[PDB]
Amino acid sequence: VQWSPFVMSFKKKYPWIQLAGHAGSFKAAANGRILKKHCESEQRCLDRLMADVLRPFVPAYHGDVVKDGERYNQMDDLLADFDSPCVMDCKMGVRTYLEEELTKARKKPSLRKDMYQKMVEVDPEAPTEEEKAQRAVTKPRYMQWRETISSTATLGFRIEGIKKEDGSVNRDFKKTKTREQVTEAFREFTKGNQNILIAYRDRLKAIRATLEISPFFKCHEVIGSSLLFIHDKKEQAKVWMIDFGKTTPLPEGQTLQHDVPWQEGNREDGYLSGLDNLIDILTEMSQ
Amino acid sequence: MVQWSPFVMSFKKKYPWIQLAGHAGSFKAAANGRILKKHCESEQRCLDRLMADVLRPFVPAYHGDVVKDGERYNQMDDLLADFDSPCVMDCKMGVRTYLEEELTKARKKPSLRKDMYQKMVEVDPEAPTEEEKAQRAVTKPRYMQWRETISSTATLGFRIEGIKKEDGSVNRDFKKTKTREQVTEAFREFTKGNQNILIAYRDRLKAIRATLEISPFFKCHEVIGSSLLFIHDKKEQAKVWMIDFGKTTPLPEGQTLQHDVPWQEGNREDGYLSGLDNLIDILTEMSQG
Ligand SMILES: Nc1ncnc2c1ncn2[C@@H]1O[C@H](COP(=O)(O)OP(=O)(O)OP(=O)(O)O)[C@@H](O)[C@H]1O
Ligand SMILES: Nc1ncnc2c1ncn2[C@@H]1O[C@H](COP(=O)(O)OP(=O)(O)OP(=O)(O)O)[C@@H](O)[C@H]1O
Numbered sequence: 001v002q003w004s005p006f007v008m009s010f011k012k013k014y015p016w017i018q019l020a021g022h023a024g025s026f027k028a029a030a031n032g033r034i035l036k037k038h039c040e041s042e043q044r045c046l047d048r049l050m051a052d053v054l055r056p057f058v059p060a061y062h063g064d065v066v067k068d069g070e071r072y073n074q075m076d077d078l079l080a081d082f083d084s085p086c087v088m089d090c091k092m093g094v095r096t097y098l099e100e101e102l103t104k105a106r107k108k109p110s111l112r113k114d115m116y117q118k119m120v121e122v123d124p125e126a127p128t129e130e131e132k133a134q135r136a137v138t139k140p141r142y143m144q145w146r147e148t149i150s151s152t153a154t155l156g157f158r159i160e161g162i163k164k165e166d167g168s169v170n171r172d173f174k175k176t177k178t179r180e181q182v183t184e185a186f187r188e189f190t191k192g193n194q195n196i197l198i199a200y201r202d203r204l205k206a207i208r209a210t211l212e213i214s215p216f217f218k219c220h221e222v223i224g225s226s227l228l229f230i231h232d233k234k235e236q237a238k239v240w241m242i243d244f245g246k247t248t249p250l251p252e253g254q255t256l257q258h259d260v261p262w263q264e265g266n267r268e269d270g271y272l273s274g275l276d277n278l279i280d281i282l283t284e285m286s287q
Numbered sequence: 288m289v290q291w292s293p294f295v296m297s298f299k300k301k302y303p304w305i306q307l308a309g310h311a312g313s314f315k316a317a318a319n320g321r322i323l324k325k326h327c328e329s330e331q332r333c334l335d336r337l338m339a340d341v342l343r344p345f346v347p348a349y350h351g352d353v354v355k356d357g358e359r360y361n362q363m364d365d366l367l368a369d370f371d372s373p374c375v376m377d378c379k380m381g382v383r384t385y386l387e388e389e390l391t392k393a394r395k396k397p398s399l400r401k402d403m404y405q406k407m408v409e410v411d412p413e414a415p416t417e418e419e420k421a422q423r424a425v426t427k428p429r430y431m432q433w434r435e436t437i438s439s440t441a442t443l444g445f446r447i448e449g450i451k452k453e454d455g456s457v458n459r460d461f462k463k464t465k466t467r468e469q470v471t472e473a474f475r476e477f478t479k480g481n482q483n484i485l486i487a488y489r490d491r492l493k494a495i496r497a498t499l500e501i502s503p504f505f506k507c508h509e510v511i512g513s514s515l516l517f518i519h520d521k522k523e524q525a526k527v528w529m530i531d532f533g534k535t536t537p538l539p540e541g542q543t544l545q546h547d548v549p550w551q552e553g554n555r556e557d558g559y560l561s562g563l564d565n566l567i568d569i570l571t572e573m574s575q576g
């Protein structure tokens with residue numbers, strides 16, 4: 001040392017931000033790490049992905065752990081290098097349920113009352129005539145219908161939640177469906193900050209380029225996963241792929257396209273269709 | 288609100304501490320953004336008094352003393368704690384860096400000093416009298432006083448002791464840094480000409496001035512050897528604190544100093560405010576252009 005006789009260390013704190021998920025799914029950990037409640041198919045995905053070209057676009061995974069009588073997966077906190085970050089969560093795919101979940105619910109189709117009540121609540125004209133005469137509905141047709149009230153079926157993604165600069169959270173995007181509404185949310189999220197737009201736009205392009213190469217990707221049905229956008233007042237802006245609770249490997253030597261329409265049986269998820277429109281919306285906003 | 292944050296996350300902030308002046312082993316790491324400085328009796332006496340004075344908010348918080356590993360320390364805040372990659376400058380304040388008692392003492396056995404002559408002739412071959420040249424010796428007296436002259440101490444009432452810049456480079460050769468031009472130059476580089484950083488520095492200096500004018504501690508202390516420590520970062524957080532009271536001593540009771548007046552043997556005046564006014568002119572002049 002010409003000038004430094006010792007190193008200094010002390011702790012600082014920042015509030016973690018949880019948009020989607022339930023109370024209890026997450027806990028704080030040391031060294032920028034986070035504990036998400038353990039889920040086997042998520043752990044499989046995170047192991048395969050640590051080794052895949054997509055690695056730079058997902059939080060670093062560090063294995064399962066046992067804390068206070070429960071199992072967790074340990075990963076990085078993507079909030080760590082940000083300061084007072086804003087955050088947006090977008091669920092990816094033209095669909096948010098696995099084919100095996102539809103199959104399974106198609107195997108014993110018990111007529112559902114509340115599912116009818118919720119469906120009329122959101123659109124009184126949604127039910128067919130027979131379904132109207134029944135004041136009830138199938139889990140099947142409902143799972144399928146739910147995807148339609150927001151941008152999921154038309155755009156291949158939907159907004160799960162937004163935490164903004166004033167410190168307010170929005171989570172009610174159940175009827176957020178059009179390009180106009182989405183752009184509008186993206187515009188408020190971002191304060192029209194052009195640098196942040198372009199950054200998000202370029203980050204997404206990189207993710208998309210890699211998804212094309214990615215061995216892991218071509219063989220998973222990537223359902224229930226999200227893009228997590230994080231930006232702060234310093235105009236740092238990144239996007240990551242998170243949430244692999246419902247992403248599952250195809251059988252051996254088999255593959256998905258991810259940009260073609262889902263037909264029941266083909267397991268296609270529309271993930272690239274989702275990502276393509278996201279890329280289009282930001283390009284336009286970023287002009 | 289409880290609407291979005293299930294828990295708090297924590298992280299270690301880690302940074303190399305910066306020592307511009309002082310000797311090796313004068314300082315140690317402590318926890319919680321604190322630092323230990325090797326114990327000094329008049330410094331501790333100063334800090335206690337400053338913890339109970341208006342000047343408190345402009346000096347490192349003092350937390351008392353502590354014995355570790357065979358040594359006594361004064362515990363204090365690390366003024367670097369909440370900056371991001373700090374740049375630091377230490378300016379030693381006053382028209383003199385020796386106390387009056389130090390001089391009186393030296394004037395006592397005022398024997399000849401070969402070494403002091405040799406340092407003087409090294410720094411300036413034209414400083415010694417013909418008598419001193421011929422004797423290859425100076426007194427201590429003469430040497431102590433001449434020493435103040437080679438930098439801006441005797442004329443401007445301060446001198447730069449060190450700078451660590453955004454480069455991660457550290458300068459300490461301000462031995463012949465004398466003129467207002469040289470100083471402006473150093474500040475300009477230290478600051479990279481940043482207007483915002485300059486104005487904050489300037490206004491933080493003016494606030495300091497305004498509190499000294501009302502400080503019962505300040506007005507009855509011979510304030511020697513203390514520094515103004517400038518710290519700023521890339522986020523343009525910029526501050527200045529008074530530091531180092533190892534050689535700051537109380538005047539006799541019921542007795543006072545002006546601090547903006549010239550020094551004369553026996554008047555104990557340190558010229559502290561003169562130095563501070565100059566720092567303010569320089570920093571104001573720079574914050575225009
Ligand atoms: N690694 C991470 N870094 C930072 N924030 C994260 C991370 N993982 C999750 N989050 C935050 O936690 C929330 C929950 O994430 P996630 O979607 O994985 O949970 P979940 O239990 O799988 O919920 P769901 O299955 O309903 O999507 C996200 O919406 C996001 O705000
Ligand atoms: N509280 C503090 N916070 C941050 N830095 C400090 C603090 N105190 C001292 N320093 C740093 O340590 C250096 C030396 O401090 P100081 O002048 O008090 O030491 P010293 O032993 O009294 O030396 P000298 O008597 O030679 O001035 C300063 O140049 C400054 O960089």
Ligand SMILES: [Mg+2]
Nearest residue numbers: 224225226243
């Ligand atoms: Mg999710």
Ligand SMILES: [Mg+2]
Nearest residue numbers: 224243244245
């Ligand atoms: Mg999930």
Ligand SMILES: [Mg+2]
Nearest residue numbers: 308512514531
């Ligand atoms: Mg000092």
Ligand SMILES: [Mg+2]
Nearest residue numbers: 512531533534
């Ligand atoms: Mg000292």
